[PDB]
RNA sequence: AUUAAGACAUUCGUGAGUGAUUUAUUUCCAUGAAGUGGCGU
């Protein structure tokens, strides 16, 4: 019976019937522009393995690819007016750790196991997830 | 039928023990039980 299905689609349902806003993950090149080999037979890379052509990130908008300010992969984006809305993971999750036992009253049982944490997510509220 | 299912942050636990509303302080200071005699030169 089934045949097809997409992957989960993050949807922001806001108000009307208006439209769904798909959210995707920030590619991990957002506003860095990767400049590969000027090809001059120098300065290779080796990826534990075979050649790679030493790739220069910048950030386009000059300086190099600082790590201390890379924050692409804690954002999720969405389409825009021909740019790009960037909406941070902690805004679409809410995350909460749930302390969980067993009361045990009895007469005999054997407390040794009656503690756990439990973490649970929370979607915010004008946010589904759909697929296909 | 899906890295699922199942599980009270619960059991025990006196806001209790010690502790003078006590110490210091004159109901005291001033003050006359006193004044006058009267009647017929």
Redesign the pocket.
């Known amino acids: 019976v089934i045949k097809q299905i997409s992957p989960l689609m993050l949807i922001e349902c806001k108000d009307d019937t208006s439209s769904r806003s798909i959210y995707f993950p920030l590619p991990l090149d957002d506003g860095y522009k990767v400049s590969f080999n000027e090809t001059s037979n120098e300065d290779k890379v080796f990826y534990n393995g075979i050649e790679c052509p030493i790739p220069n990130v910048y950030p386009a908008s000059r300086k190099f690819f600082d790590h201390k300010t890379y924050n692409n992969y804690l954002f999720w984006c969405t389409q825009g007016n021909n740019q790009i809305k960037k909406l941070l993971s902690d805004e679409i999750w809410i995350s909460k750790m749930?302390?969980?036992?067993?009361?045990?009253?009895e007469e005999g049982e054997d407390n040794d196991?009656?503690?756990?944490k439990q973490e649970f997510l929370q979607l915010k509220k004008s946010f589904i997830y759909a697929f296909y």
């Open positions: 749930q302390i969980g036992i067993t009361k045990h009253v196991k009656s503690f756990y």
